[PDB]
Amino acid sequence: SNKINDALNQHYKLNVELGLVYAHYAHVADDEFDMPYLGKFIQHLSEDKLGVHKEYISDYFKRNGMKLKTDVSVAVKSIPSDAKALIQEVYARENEVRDHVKAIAKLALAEDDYESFYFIQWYVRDGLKDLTEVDDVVKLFNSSNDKLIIEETIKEMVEEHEIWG
Amino acid sequence: SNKINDALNQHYKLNVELGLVYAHYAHVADDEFDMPYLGKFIQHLSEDKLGVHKEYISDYFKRNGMKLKTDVSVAVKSIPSDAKALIQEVYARENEVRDHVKAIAKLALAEDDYESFYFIQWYVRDGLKDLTEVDDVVKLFNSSNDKLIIEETIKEMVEHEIWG
Amino acid sequence: SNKINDALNQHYKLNVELGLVYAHYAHVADDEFDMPYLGKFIQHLSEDKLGVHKEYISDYFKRNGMKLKTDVSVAVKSIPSDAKALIQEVYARENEVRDHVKAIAKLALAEDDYESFYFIQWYVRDGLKDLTEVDDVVKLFNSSNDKLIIEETIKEMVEHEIWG
Amino acid sequence: SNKINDALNQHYKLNVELGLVYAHYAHVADDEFDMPYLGKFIQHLSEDKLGVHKEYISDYFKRNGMKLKTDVSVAVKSIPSDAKALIQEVYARENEVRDHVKAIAKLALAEDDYESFYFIQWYVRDGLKDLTEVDDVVKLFNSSNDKLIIEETIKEMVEKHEIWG
Amino acid sequence: SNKINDALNQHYKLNVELGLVYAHYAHVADDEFDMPYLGKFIQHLSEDKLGVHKEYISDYFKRNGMKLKTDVSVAVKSIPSDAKALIQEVYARENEVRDHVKAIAKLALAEDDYESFYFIQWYVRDGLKDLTEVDDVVKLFNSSNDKLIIEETIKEMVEKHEIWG
Amino acid sequence: SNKINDALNQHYKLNVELGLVYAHYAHVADDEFDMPYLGKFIQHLSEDKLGVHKEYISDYFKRNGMKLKTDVSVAVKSIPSDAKALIQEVYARENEVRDHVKAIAKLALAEDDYESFYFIQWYVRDGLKDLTEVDDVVKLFNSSNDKLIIEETIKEMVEHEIWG
Ligand SMILES: [Fe+3]
Ligand SMILES: [Fe+3]
Ligand SMILES: [Fe+3]
Ligand SMILES: [Fe+3]
Ligand SMILES: [Fe+3]
Ligand SMILES: [Fe+3]
Structure with missing residues (x-):
């Protein structure tokens, strides 16, 4: 199939x-807002986005017979003013990723392709998992104003569910 | 300094x-040329390039007080015909990386900055190590013609006092 | 060489x-600002300055046959008002020893003495390491004014492959 | 008390x-007389004198409420002509430190300050300890004229009591 | 480069x-002066010179692409008179190879070749290490007169840093 | 004795x-023919020839009272064209050193000197051992055409009561 091929290539480049x-x-x-453990958290997120999240798509392509494209263009020009807006931007990005995955799943169910449905269940789950993992940190900035208390809490976070994990 | 900052940003981009x-x-x-272990070898090279090679630059920028910029663009549309041409292409890329690091090190000695020289020693070592590791594989396609033998040798490969 | 000898004597007395x-x-x-863990931190720094930082100079002199000179003088009469100014003074001292070591290394290369270059690499690295250790504390006094929280952070506080 | 504070500051400077x-x-x-183990021995003495012997004074000042004063100015212009005169100079220095501690002890007991008397008992003991360990090495050079046997015995001293310990 | 190549071939030959x-x-x-442990010491220096000191040069040549050359010619025709002269001869030999390596390093730094500079750092360090390890043995023939004490010393030496070793 | 002395000195120099x-x-x-394990093999042979094969003779001289000489002159100019001619040249050199030690043993038995005979028995045995273990690699090149197969079996080679 080709529509599924296009959709999965799109998700690959997005990731x-x-x-x-x-x-x-x-x-x-880490360098400007003086919150190193927030940097650790977001760096874990970036490693996860660049690792399995795309290795799985590549392996599925090798496994069923589809074709892979690669074309990336990224440039960070503006940076949010403080840490609250930064974590909220991360939140919005994840929230959009969930919508993209839902579109892919609907398409796969529409074309009478059930291998792709079984394959995309994993993303359907991991999206909600990661979104809540981010929102639990978002809710810390609505609780305290001592930056070091937030630091200790996120440190204890950095240092498994049956249904969602 | 400023020239060193520019050079390190360009190196981040290259990696x-x-x-x-x-x-x-x-x-x-892996998918086309029916050679999985060559694919694993190249994938491990890719993870090496996307990990410490740039994490170290980021952490050094955090330490000494320099700025970072992120600006990437890439799209492949020219792929070789067999495996030998692919591995030779990899060889050429590695050699060019070696050249660029050499130029950075000379520039660093020119500015009387010695923390930069000390930092770049690691890349000066890793460049030749990686080039030798890739040439070891490039040598295989000139010694046989049966693909499964080459594959088994590469699998056994993926299974020094100075350079390590 | 005599000039390297004079520079090394300067570094010895400075340390x-x-x-x-x-x-x-x-x-x-520890006694006047009621912050004992900051006191243990600065005590570790002083022990490091009084130990290997001069042991290695004396050992180098024993090896390459240079004369040693012990002429010191110090008198502490004016101290800052609170902990922030104290840790900022520490920061400045380290930032200056960096530049002193840089001058030493430049002089060493300028007159064709490469064993002193290999020797001074250690200090070229340890300067940045110690400066980051001090800065990671000088930037704790901008995150909160609850002094006991800073104390707990320093308590839990008290290596990179390149900057080890 | 001011007399005890002055005397203890003086002893800090001396150490x-x-x-x-x-x-x-x-x-x-180590460098001029070809006797590395004599160097090890004197370096052990130096590290002692620069460690606990002033660590304790500063800690006691913290405990009872006195003030500290750093005023140090030392310099080396002359040195002995052989190892014998060297170790004899070391002996003289320790011998004087004993008398300094004795004066401080008399002063401490003259002013009804018994915590400081308890404190200075430690130095009263360690003075004789260090003096006897120095004399056990200064008396070797009255037993031989070969430097290497002295080296052997000093090494076996360094590498290897209920009242005075 | 051709200068680096000729210099490194020359160093192989010297080793x-x-x-x-x-x-x-x-x-x-060992045979003519009846000093077996001095013999073992010099033998260890010999095999150390004949091992890694040239294996590393051969390996660097295999890596970068230079070519090797084999040319040896040695004849020992006049041996020193006693043990003192022998140890002084080996001392001077090491003191010479030191500035040989220094010249190689100067040349490598002058020709915009940083791989070879990083390489020769090893020899820059080992030169001084071996020089002092030999000088602490030549220093023994001034300390005593009888041969067996020197023998005991060299024995407890051969029967056993952060920057230099 | 003197004849055995000169013969053993010639053998020292030969080795x-x-x-x-x-x-x-x-x-x-290793470098030109792209066969690293053959290189490791010949390296083991060279280490053997430069270790015990001559420290034994020096020990014997120390023991019975003969005198040692040193005279070396080596300069390699022409190397074979590929690995087969290389290994055959090594075979010839070994086959010659066998004859040399046989002649030494005959002379030692003719002079009615029996400690020298008892000593040279070791070389009499080790010559045949080494020659067999070189011949069984020489005949690999006359049994196949691929280089990787030869290389794998040499690798496994690298990984008796009478002749041991
Ligand atoms: Fe995930
Ligand atoms: Fe790498
Ligand atoms: Fe330090
Ligand atoms: Fe003591
Ligand atoms: Fe060595
Ligand atoms: Fe043999």
Whole structure:
């Protein structure tokens, strides 16, 4: 099939681009806002976006017979003013990734292709998992104003569910 | 300093682009040319390029007080015909990386900055190490013609006092 | 060579005097500002200045046959008002020893003495390491004014492959 | 009390200066007289004098409420002509430190300050300890004229009591 | 480069020649001066020169693409008179190879070749290490007169840093 | 005695020169012909010829009271065209050293000297051992056409009561 091929290529390029953006966000969060463990958290997110999240698509292409494209273009020009807006930008990005995955799943169900449905269940789950992992950190900035308390909390976070994991 | 900052940003860019291209090459060698272990070898090169090679630059920028910029662009549309041409292409990329690092090191000695020289020693070592590791594989396609023998040798490869 | 000998004697006396000053600053920080873990931090810094930082100079002199000279003088009479100014003074001292070591290394290369270059690489690295260790604390006094929180952070506080 | 504070500051200064001078003597004994283990021995003495012997004074000042004063100015212009005169100079320095501690102890007991008397008992003991360990090495040079047997016995001393310990 | 190549070939040649002459010196020290442990010491220097000191040059040539050359010519025709002269000869040999390596490093730094500079750092360090490890043995023939004490010393030496070693 | 002395000195010199030439052949075999394990093999041979094969003679001289001489002159100019001619040249050198030691043993038995005979028995045995273990690699090149197969079996080679 070709429509599924296009959709999965799109998700592949999206994942790579978001990985790069998250890496830059983590460096600028550690270097300027003086919150190193927030940088650690976002760096873990970027490693996860650049690793299995695209290795799985590549392996599925090798496995069923589809064809792969690569064309990436990214440039970070503006940076949010403080850490709150930065974590909220990350939140919005993840929220959009969920919508993209839902579109892919609907398409796969429409073309009478059930291998792609079984394959995309994994992303359907991991999207909600990562979104809540990010929102739990977002909710810390609505609780305290001592930056070091937030630091200790995120440190304890950095240092498995049956249904969602 | 400023020249060193520019050079290190350009090196960050170069490493990111190499990593992405190597990932694509490894996929196309596994899927098309019927050689999985060559694909694993190239994929591990790609993970090496996308990991510490740039994490170190980022951490050094965090330490000494320099600025970072992220600006990437890449799209492959020219792929070789067999495996030998692919591995020779990889060889050429590695050699050019070696050249660029040499130029950075000379520039660093020119500015009387010695933390930069100390930092770049690591890349000066890793360049030749990686080039030798790739040439070891390029040598195989000139010693046989049966693909499965080459594959088994590469698998056994993927299974020094100075350079390590 | 005589000029490298004079530069190394300068570095020796500088380290000794810094060690004594840091010892007194640690006592003051623990006794007058009610921050014992900052005191243990500065005490570790003073021990590091009074130990290997001069052991290695004396050992090098024993090896290559250079004369040693012990002429020191220090007197601590004016101390800052609070912990922020104290840790900022520490920061400045380290930022200056960096430049001193850089001058030494340039002089070493300029007159064709390469064993001194290989020797001074150690200090070229340790300068940036110690500067980051101090800065990671000088930037804790901008995150919060609850002094006990800073104390707990320093408590939990007290290596990179390149900058080890 | 001011007399005890002055005397303890003086002793702090004295210990620091002895530490530095002993460091230089250890270097010159290793480098010019071909006796590395004599250097090890004197370097051990120097590291003692620069460590606990002033660590304790500063800590006691913290405990009871006195003030500290750093004022150090030492320099080396002259050195002995052989290892014998060197170790005899070391002996003289320790011998004087004993009398300094004795004066401080008399003063401490004259002013009804018994915590400081308890404190100075430690130095009263370690004075004789260090003096006897120095004399056990200065008396070797009255037993031989071959430097290498002295080296052997000093090595077996360094590498290897209920009242005085 | 051709200058780096000629210099490194010359160093290979120097190392093999020193290995041969040290081996002969060790035999003639054990047999004719009745000093077996001095013989073992010089033998270890010999095999150290004949091992890694040239294996590393051969390996660097295999890596970068230079070519090797083999040319040896050695004849030991006049041996020193006693043990003192022998140890002084080996001292001077090391003190010469030091500035040989220094000239190589100067040349490598002058020709915009940083791989070879990084390479020769190893020899820059080992030169001084071996020089001092030999000088601490030549220093023993001034300390005593009888041969067996020197023998005991060299024995406890051969029967066992962060920057230099 | 003196005849045995001169013969053993000639043998000492022979062994030294063989060891050096073998080290150079090993470098050539690894670099030009692309066969690293053959290079490791010849390197083991050279280490053997430069170690015990001569320290035994020096020990014997120490023991019975003969005198030692040193005279070495080695210069390699022409190397074979490929690995087969290389290994055959090594075979010839070994086959010659066997004859040399046989002549030494005959002379030692003619002079009615029996400690020298008892000593040279070791070389009489080890010559045949080494020659067999070189011949069984020589005949690999006359049994196949691929280089990777030969290389794998030599690798496994690298990984008796009478002759041991
Ligand atoms: Fe995920
Ligand atoms: Fe690498
Ligand atoms: Fe330090
Ligand atoms: Fe003591
Ligand atoms: Fe060595
Ligand atoms: Fe043999």
